[PDB]
Tab-separated table of N, CA and C in Angstrom:
chain	number	residue	atom	x	y	z
A	1	UNK	N	0.839	-1.190	0.000
A	1	UNK	CA	0.000	0.000	0.000
A	1	UNK	C	0.884	1.253	0.000
A	2	UNK	N	0.384	2.321	0.615
A	2	UNK	CA	0.895	3.657	0.398
A	2	UNK	C	2.287	3.842	0.983
A	3	UNK	N	2.579	3.185	2.105
A	3	UNK	CA	3.937	3.208	2.657
A	3	UNK	C	4.926	2.591	1.707
A	4	UNK	N	4.608	1.410	1.226
A	4	UNK	CA	5.451	0.741	0.237
A	4	UNK	C	5.655	1.644	-1.027
A	5	UNK	N	4.558	2.209	-1.513
A	5	UNK	CA	4.537	3.066	-2.700
A	5	UNK	C	5.459	4.251	-2.466
A	6	UNK	N	5.256	4.941	-1.340
A	6	UNK	CA	6.185	5.965	-0.888
A	6	UNK	C	7.638	5.513	-0.981
A	7	UNK	N	7.934	4.390	-0.361
A	7	UNK	CA	9.300	3.938	-0.233
A	7	UNK	C	9.955	3.666	-1.614
A	8	UNK	N	9.221	3.030	-2.542
A	8	UNK	CA	9.773	2.741	-3.874
A	8	UNK	C	10.094	4.019	-4.669
A	9	UNK	N	9.220	5.001	-4.607
A	9	UNK	CA	9.480	6.291	-5.211
A	9	UNK	C	10.633	6.996	-4.571
A	10	UNK	N	10.702	6.933	-3.258
A	10	UNK	CA	11.807	7.539	-2.545
A	10	UNK	C	13.166	6.931	-2.935
A	11	UNK	N	13.236	5.613	-2.942
A	11	UNK	CA	14.431	4.918	-3.407
A	11	UNK	C	14.702	5.225	-4.876
A	12	UNK	N	13.661	5.160	-5.691
A	12	UNK	CA	13.761	5.310	-7.154
A	12	UNK	C	14.362	6.641	-7.540
A	13	UNK	N	13.981	7.674	-6.798
A	13	UNK	CA	14.529	8.986	-7.015
A	13	UNK	C	15.991	9.177	-6.548
A	14	UNK	N	16.566	8.208	-5.857
A	14	UNK	CA	17.961	8.350	-5.508
A	14	UNK	C	18.293	8.457	-4.058
A	15	UNK	N	17.262	8.530	-3.197
A	15	UNK	CA	17.465	8.603	-1.749
A	15	UNK	C	17.876	7.254	-1.106
A	16	UNK	N	18.625	7.326	-0.008
A	16	UNK	CA	19.086	6.093	0.640
A	16	UNK	C	18.040	5.514	1.566
A	17	UNK	N	18.308	4.302	2.005
A	17	UNK	CA	17.366	3.517	2.742
A	17	UNK	C	16.965	4.146	4.084
A	18	UNK	N	17.956	4.677	4.800
A	18	UNK	CA	17.698	5.362	6.037
A	18	UNK	C	16.783	6.597	5.844
A	19	UNK	N	17.020	7.394	4.816
A	19	UNK	CA	16.085	8.506	4.416
A	19	UNK	C	14.683	8.015	4.086
A	20	UNK	N	14.565	6.988	3.262
A	20	UNK	CA	13.271	6.584	2.817
A	20	UNK	C	12.457	5.852	3.887
A	21	UNK	N	13.142	5.102	4.758
A	21	UNK	CA	12.494	4.528	5.975
A	21	UNK	C	11.967	5.566	6.950
A	22	UNK	N	12.684	6.675	7.098
A	22	UNK	CA	12.173	7.796	7.892
A	22	UNK	C	11.000	8.528	7.226
A	23	UNK	N	11.098	8.729	5.892
A	23	UNK	CA	10.081	9.470	5.177
A	23	UNK	C	8.725	8.750	5.220
A	24	UNK	N	8.765	7.430	5.043
A	24	UNK	CA	7.628	6.667	4.553
A	24	UNK	C	6.948	5.857	5.625
């Protein structure tokens, strides 16, 4: 769902895992 969706876009755009785990 939306957390996962968030996370894939966040990673896809170039952000690291620690950033995208915090964002999403």
